[PDB]
Amino acid sequence: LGFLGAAGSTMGAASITLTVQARLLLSGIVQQQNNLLKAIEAQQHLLKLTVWGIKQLQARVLTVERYLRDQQLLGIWGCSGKLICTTAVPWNASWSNKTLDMIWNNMTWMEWEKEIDNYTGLIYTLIEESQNQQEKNEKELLELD
Amino acid sequence: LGFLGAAGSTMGAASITLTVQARLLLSGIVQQQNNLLKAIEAQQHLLKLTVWGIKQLQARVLTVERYLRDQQLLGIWGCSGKLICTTAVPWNASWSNKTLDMIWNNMTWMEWEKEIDNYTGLIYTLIEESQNQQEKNEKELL
Amino acid sequence: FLGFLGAAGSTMGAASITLTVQARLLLSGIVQQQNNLLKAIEAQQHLLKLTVWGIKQLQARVLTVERYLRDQQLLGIWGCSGKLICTTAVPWNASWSNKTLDMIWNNMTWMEWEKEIDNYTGLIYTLIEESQNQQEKNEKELL
Amino acid sequence: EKLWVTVYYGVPVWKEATTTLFCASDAKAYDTEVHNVWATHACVPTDPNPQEVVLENVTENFNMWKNNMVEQMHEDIISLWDESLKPCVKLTPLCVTLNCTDLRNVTNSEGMRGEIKNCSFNITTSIKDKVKKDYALFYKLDVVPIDNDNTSYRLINCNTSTITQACPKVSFEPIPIHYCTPAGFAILKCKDKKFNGTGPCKNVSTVQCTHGIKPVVSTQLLLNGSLAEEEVVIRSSNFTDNAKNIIVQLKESVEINCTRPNNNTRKSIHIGPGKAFYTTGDIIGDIRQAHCNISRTKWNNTLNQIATKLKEQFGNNKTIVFNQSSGGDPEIVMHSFNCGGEFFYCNSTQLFNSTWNFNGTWNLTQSNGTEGNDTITLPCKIKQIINMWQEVGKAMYAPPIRGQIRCSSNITGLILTRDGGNNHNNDTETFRPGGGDMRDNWRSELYKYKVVKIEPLGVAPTKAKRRV
Amino acid sequence: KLWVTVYYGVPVWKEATTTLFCASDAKAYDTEVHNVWATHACVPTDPNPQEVVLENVTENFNMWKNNMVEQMHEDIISLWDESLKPCVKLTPLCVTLNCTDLRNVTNSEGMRGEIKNCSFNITTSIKDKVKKDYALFYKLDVVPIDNDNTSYRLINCNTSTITQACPKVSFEPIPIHYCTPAGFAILKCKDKKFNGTGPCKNVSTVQCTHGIKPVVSTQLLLNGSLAEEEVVIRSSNFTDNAKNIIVQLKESVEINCTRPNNNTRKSIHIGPGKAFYTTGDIIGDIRQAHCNISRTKWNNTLNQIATKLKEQFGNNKTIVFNQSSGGDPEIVMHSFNCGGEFFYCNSTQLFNSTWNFNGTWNLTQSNGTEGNDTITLPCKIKQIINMWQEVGKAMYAPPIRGQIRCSSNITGLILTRDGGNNHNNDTETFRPGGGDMRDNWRSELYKYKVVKIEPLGVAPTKAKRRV
Amino acid sequence: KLWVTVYYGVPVWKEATTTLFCASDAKAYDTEVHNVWATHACVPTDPNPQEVVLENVTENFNMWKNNMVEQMHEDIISLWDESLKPCVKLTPLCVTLNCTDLRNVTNSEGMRGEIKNCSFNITTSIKDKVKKDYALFYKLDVVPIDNDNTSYRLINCNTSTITQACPKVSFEPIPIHYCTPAGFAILKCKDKKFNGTGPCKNVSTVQCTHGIKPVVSTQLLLNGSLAEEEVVIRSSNFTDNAKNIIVQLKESVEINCTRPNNNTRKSIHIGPGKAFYTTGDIIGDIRQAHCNISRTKWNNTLNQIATKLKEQFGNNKTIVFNQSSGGDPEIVMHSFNCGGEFFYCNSTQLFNSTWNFNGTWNLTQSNGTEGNDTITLPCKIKQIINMWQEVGKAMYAPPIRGQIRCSSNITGLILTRDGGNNHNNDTETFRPGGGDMRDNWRSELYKYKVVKIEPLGVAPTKAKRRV
Ligand SMILES: *[C@@H]1O[C@H](CO)[C@@H](O[C@@H]2O[C@H](CO)[C@@H](O[C@@H]3O[C@H](CO[C@H]4O[C@H](CO[C@H]5O[C@H](CO)[C@@H](O)[C@H](O)[C@@H]5O)[C@@H](O)[C@H](O)[C@@H]4O)[C@@H](O)[C@H](O[C@H]4O[C@H](CO)[C@@H](O)[C@H](O)[C@@H]4O[C@H]4O[C@H](CO)[C@@H](O)[C@H](O)[C@@H]4O)[C@@H]3O)[C@H](O)[C@H]2NC(C)=O)[C@H](O)[C@H]1NC(C)=O
Ligand SMILES: *[C@@H]1O[C@H](CO)[C@@H](O[C@@H]2O[C@H](CO)[C@@H](O[C@@H]3O[C@H](CO)[C@@H](O)[C@H](O)[C@@H]3O)[C@H](O)[C@H]2NC(C)=O)[C@H](O)[C@H]1NC(C)=O
Ligand SMILES: *[C@@H]1O[C@H](CO)[C@@H](O[C@@H]2O[C@H](CO)[C@@H](O[C@@H]3O[C@H](CO)[C@@H](O)[C@H](O)[C@@H]3O)[C@H](O)[C@H]2NC(C)=O)[C@H](O)[C@H]1NC(C)=O
Ligand SMILES: *[C@@H]1O[C@H](CO)[C@@H](O[C@@H]2O[C@H](CO)[C@@H](O)[C@H](O)[C@H]2NC(C)=O)[C@H](O)[C@H]1NC(C)=O
Ligand SMILES: *[C@@H]1O[C@H](CO[C@@H]2O[C@@H](C)[C@@H](O)[C@@H](O)[C@@H]2O)[C@@H](O)[C@H](O)[C@H]1NC(C)=O
């Protein structure tokens, strides 16, 4: 339930309000359903070393891996909070030529990130290192004074 | 170590003492025994088999997700930080119309959950939806 | 700059800047994340059922997950969960290595420094937990 | 005019990805401790309320011919069958010369010519000191003639494989299986009422779990599968290539009443330590050949439909011809499938014997009473031994089911092969029934689905900036 | 006016079932026992066990419905299956046997064929030549076929596969601390007296269970635990007769058991390198295996048990200890494993005591310390152990070279109350029971209940979000 | 006054032992050829490995106590066992064999009786007929029994169980990358010359080992890694004797090896679907397998190794290169696998030099191919190969159709310093060694070591908390 099926809508309207409500719905749901089924089956003890059981165990690992890598990344860039955080990293001129309206009201999320793929590693690295190190230095200076 | 010793005590007795501090130590001890065990066995390599290798592996899994599913809950309502955190959700009198004396100085945590068992899921979902309203207010402030 | 633990030969101050890069690869598991995606086979045929490598790879995954989970749990128990760097109310007892900050941040490397402190590592960690418990009791006194 | 990088979690963004799948069947299947069912033991509970969020303004591309899930679950059910029969008896000692009678007797009208066989022999059990003469019953399909001495015979795949009987208790009724994905992954559903199986799909929704899919395996005729919507739909890798099989999904379910009208007493000979070879004891009453009931008009109407469809695909001014399989392994030559566990090889010659015309295909068939459309009866056989489709090795024996057996499958699909014979200036297109490939029988259920991982991380410029 | 407040780390548990792992302290592993019952997989135990006391707690306990009893049952089944899995199947030795009387008539010799020197023909790795040879078998192992006053086989050969237990693997019991994973806890009922299931007022909690020796024994409990201050009777329904009666003793009764023979351990090469192990011969007199019980001590314990059984079924009823009714050898005769060797001991002497409520009187001891202090249990020996749950999967115990000497501690009983026509008489006829390993484990895990830990909690407080 | 400051992601590592996974190149999967005994399970190699260098670091190494050697040793053993375990057991074939030394006395032929046309009687899948079937074997596979001129069997029957390799699975080794799970790292010594134990001048790290081809070779290291500017000699104790001496070469020596026989593979069917693969016959003339080796190249290589050995055992020394003393063919006669067939080559020619005190230094020159007539290696074939550390579990190598062609590069030598009573002579002798998969692993893993990365860190800082 609450699966983000608003890929067709551009970040112009859905991202501002509709997606965040749906995202909170999905995060709570994909947590409630998965762990509900897990608890029920674990009590039943039907789970075993059987072929299907090793498929379930492999998937249980993948869920954990995906969730943990995501949360790690988020915490490694300070955004341990909610789904929307604003970094102090400027937008490089190398990726541009699109107006705020283009990026938001005209470009769908799937289409937008499909042009940033050549720069995804650079953007993610230059976010985590910049803001996190700078904020650590600031905290240290404030505590010293 | 640091196991639920105050579970026989009432909600308030337990809260003013062990729940705030001993339980924090209990989570640390849970990590300490895991840190020692998961290391020493890693210095064995006779582990990670099937007859007991799968048993311990399944247990380690179950610990992992059983802890994450709670971290996730804390994340969905924003309480990823302090173990004790309040909510903007008003406690509806419909859920147990009893005075705070009967709630804390009387009911113990174990019997408290049984009366609130029907409310549990309802309240947990209400807390996250209230967080969404607060997040929209935060966007307005931004 | 340095791809990985380049600041290993560097002192305390130099290694602080690259901490985020070294902390991203803790659970990144980039080599393991992609399975046989190029050949469009998941986990090389679900680890070929339970082949010798299948077991080895699956076990290596849980260790990356539990090791990071344990580290994050430690961060959580002392409060500074999300924060990579956090101050603590624990005064630094002068007994552990009587050295000036200059010698530490400008001369002593992190790898060489965590051979001295190994003796008192657990002591220090528990001191941090009790200081957080003291902070919680002080908060209860305020309430 | 300053834009800063802002991290957004939970962006509606997915990418092509292949992953592990896990089964989910039914709570009712667990109820009554059926156990024998070889597929529901480790399945998780199906969510009673499915989640089918619809996608709007989306035209996702789909390639069912390049579907991961197909191969994934193909090897899954290939291994799943192997694990089920792995603890069961290996019928290695049975590879012996057999003294086989006429039927059992000449107590004679006579529609049989050897189906009972009454193969007798001398075999050794776990007691490795005494030969133990006895006898069992086998349809000619399982007894290969040897030595041409007259009554010398041996099991069909003794010199090519190892025959393992299924554990008698093991029941072989498929139950709906809902593939579900680990979180962070989703299944995209191509909910268009008409899909070529290739190219972009406009009407599109998604599910965290596939709809119920019985892993029914059948050749030529798809049984108890899925129905097409409003129109019969034909999907091929390359229609103009002859080698490519042709998936034909019917929009109409056709009832096929298959039965084994022989009351059978079942005898369990003990061979080896606690290992027991289950075989037929005898047949009570007359033996009647297994038959299947097919409505003539309903089938001919479906024939008209698929014929018009193949004309539309190729040339609307072509003659269509329907022949039977050229030759090869029995599975492809005749419609074979499991019924209550016993396997029936029905000579579906009559099913594909009608040739239509571009000039023809003008009207449909209307029955004038029950005796008008007297249901066609298909000559069906029983093959107890089945070699794995992929490898002649590890052939599996089917324990005989005691007494009466009767099934009522609904034909939901067809498998066809075009032969590029020299009929250029003839336009006479011949299509022959094809099968022998489990993957083809899964492509006919997985086409609408597609697995994509979800990467809910996203970054975009915003005038907002982190406080210093 | 109040708001719900999320509470993490709340003292709340719930009954649940979960995977549990073994833990042996690796003392056996450092010794180098070559993996006994999979000791190389048990994680080392905590140096100091923790048993936090749960004051003001009345947790209900249900030992009969406990999941641990069945989880352990299946895990122990898997252990015994893994042990025999790589071992040598004995399919070729399912043949006809030419057997002598014992070893010779140059023998007093009360034994009447317990060695039955059997000889036969076999096919070794060289699958072209027979090889006559002789090995020794106790009558329990060999069944005679056709009764032509000769010709023998093996009891389960035709209907069941036998697998010889590997000699390198010892079968000595080792303590096991079934430890629960984090987020789960084991509740420990510390009442001085229990009825199997019921509310418990003295309760504690353990991260791992106490060390447990998974011994499979029938009609007796060996190397087990001791009750507190009083013998305790436990049964799901004492009022019905079909259910077994679990008894736990307050004191231990030493059981000196030994095979007093020097045995040469001949090995026969069968197939490609697979060596079937047997007994060459027995140097010296063939003294029958026997067990030593204190006559006074066993009577005193039997009177304690009788008084407890009287309490259960009224003072009016008198307690009768009759011998096992009949059935499989393990049920009819008490049977265990000694030093990797399985015994079979006649239990008639132990269960031949009738107690009248009028005559109960006191306990009978002896000023004399010499004579009438030893109850010698006539023990026979069986190697081919039939599986307890399934007809197939029978196992073979290789003989242990030399004399095998053991000394256990009788720590309880397994009994069966019958529906006799002596109900009008008012006599409770109690007979030894066995054949179910779950009862053996119920005798240990009764005091434990598995509950998960839910640190999540909600609570109305005057506190409100600091927005 | 200072306060503790918890640091996360700090570059501190501690020597650790952990499980590692294999990551072969994407190209190996692209072939679609069935797994080569250890291949498909592996994850694909990351296009470019990260070899981040650790400047200002002097990390100590211990190649002789590295866990990875043992871990991989066990991995390669288990990988072979899993690959050949589903295949056919050749236990039914342990039968008396009637053999002719040569099918035709075509005199001529170098072989005196290598062909040994052995015809046996085997029960087929049909357990009713004995079918006399002929098959071809080498002397190394058949033991003469009964002292009869034609009575033969197999080397490992009563001794061990033979299992043939599945023909579809090939044997061409492929480069493998050992990668650690995240939070762990591999340190690579960058020192041009390394003793293998002690501090490293330049250190680097890789999350993945360089590609290693797990070739198993004796007295030689084939298709192995090379040294830098100088042949390196490593041994835990050079002053010891039993310690095998590892040598890594700086220059690769090409070795061209081929079995020059066109062979047809008869597939005899034995039992229910189990088909044993043998040799139908040899097409054309029969030529013994050989290997070609440059004279000068080998001599100059021996010159460099002899200099290195005088350096490590006193400047004034005379090193005699001799052959193995005796024992199993594995370590006496150099052996390896060419195209999935085992080759045993008598490398007596390689080490037949007495040497001079000052004869060294003048490197010999190639005055034409007539001068440097390439060294010919008398090679044999042993189809039945035995487990190196296990008496049982022997494996049969199916024959390969056609003529095999191989061209590996010599990259290393294994040596054994004998402690002969010749200290006054100062004639150091170094016999070829081998016989241990670990020795091969140590040669390629010397530069690697695995360390857990602890991101948790402590440090006093003036910074305090916010009350
Ligand atoms: C791999 O490489 C090796 C190395 O090149 C090849 O083998 C080499 O072959 C060389 C000959 O071709 C051989 O050289 C001979 O060495 C003999 C002994 O060497 C020592 O002694 C001499 C002389 O020192 C003496 O005097 C001092 C005091 O001044 C004393 O202290 C000493 O103890 C000695 O008494 C030194 O020069 C060396 O350096 C060593 O210390 C010599 O006897 C020999 O001299 C001549 O006599 C030999 C017969 O006795 C004869 O075989 C040889 O050819 C010499 O013949 C002379 O006369 C003829 C005719 O006039 C003339 O054409 C010659 O040119 C020569 O003048 C040589 O000096 C190397 O010792 C030897 N090295 C090794 C390690 O074996 C090997 O072939 C090659 N393999 C391949 C496959 O390529
Ligand atoms: C893609 O999805 C759209 C929307 O569901 C499909 O269009 C729908 O087509 C059906 C007929 O096939 C229409 O039903 C008709 O509705 C009208 C009134 O709207 C009524 O008068 C008719 O009797 C009939 O019931 C339906 O309205 C129509 N929906 C829309 C929104 O136009 C379309 O067929 C799908 N295409 C594919 C390729 O799947
Ligand atoms: C073990 O012994 C206990 C007693 O120590 C038995 O428990 C008691 O059994 C009775 C009847 O089975 C329970 O019912 C009672 O009935 C009267 C009828 O008026 C009612 O007034 C009581 O208050 C109660 O309902 C009783 O609850 C139960 N427990 C106690 C504490 O008495 C038990 O049956 C024995 N066996 C087992 C397996 O526990
Ligand atoms: C099913 O229909 C689609 C749409 O017409 C076909 O896809 C087109 O293929 C042609 C080439 O034959 C291209 O020129 C078009 O651009 C394609 N359209 C798109 C956007 O998909 C598809 O080939 C048909 N498939 C079958 C099996 O007939
Ligand atoms: C037991 O039953 C008694 C019935 O009368 C008794 O009959 C016999 C057994 C005599 O020996 C004597 O015990 C009695 O006269 C009841 O009187 C008695 O209360 C019942 N219960 C007890 C506590 O014994």
Numbering used by the authors:
A (entry chain B): 520 to 664
B (entry chain D): 520 to 661
C (entry chain F): 519 to 661
D (entry chain A): 32 to 139, 144 to 146, 150 to 309, 312 to 321, 321A, 322 to 395, 395A, 396 to 464, ...
E (entry chain C), F (entry chain E): 33 to 139, 144 to 146, 150 to 309, 312 to 321, 321A, 322 to 395, 395A, 396 to 464, ...
Paper text:
The resulting mature Env, which consists of a gp120 exterior subunit and a gp41 transmembrane subunit in each of the three protomers, is incorporated into budding virions. During virus entry, gp120 engages the target cell receptors, CD4 and CCR5 (or CXCR4), and gp41 fuses the viral and cell membranes. Here, we present cryo-EM structures at near-atomic resolution of two cleaved full-length HIV-1 Env trimers purified from cell membranes in styrene-maleic acid lipid nanoparticles without antibodies or receptors. Cleaved and uncleaved Env trimers assumed remarkably consistent yet distinct asymmetric conformations, with one smaller and two larger opening angles.
The full-length AD8 Env and its lysine-rich derivative, AE2, which contains changes that favor the functional pretriggered conformation, were expressed in A549 human lung epithelial cells. Membranes containing the AE2 Env were cross-linked with 3,3’-dithiobis (sulfosuccinimidyl propionate) (DTSSP). Extensive 3D classification of the AE2 data resulted in two 3D maps refined to resolutions of 3.8 Å and 5.0 Å, designated AE2.1 and AE2.2 respectively. The other two protomers in the AE2.1 Env are translated around 1 Å toward the trimer axis relative to their positions in the AD8 Env, suggesting a more compact AE2.1 trimer structure. The α9 helices in the three aligned protomers of the AD8 Env trimers exhibit rotations of up to 7.4°. The extent of α9 helix rotation is even greater, up to 11.7°, among the protomers of the AE2.1 Env trimer. By contrast, in the interprotomer interface with the smaller opening angle, HR1N forms a loop that is well resolved in the AE2.1 Env; in the AD8 Env, the density associated with this loop is weaker, likely indicating a higher level of dynamics. Interactions such as a potential hydrogen bond between Thr 51 and Glu 560 could stabilize the gp120–gp41 interface in the AE2.1 Env, allowing the conformationally labile HR1N loop to be resolved. To evaluate the potential impact of the cleaved Env trimer’s quaternary structure on CD4 binding, we rigidly fit a gp120 core structure bound to two-domain CD443 into the three gp120 subunits of the AE2.1 trimer structure, including the glycans that were rigorously built according to the density map. In the interprotomer interface with the smallest opening angle (interface 2 in Fig. 4a, b), CD4 encounters a tight fit with the Asn 301 glycan on the adjacent protomer.
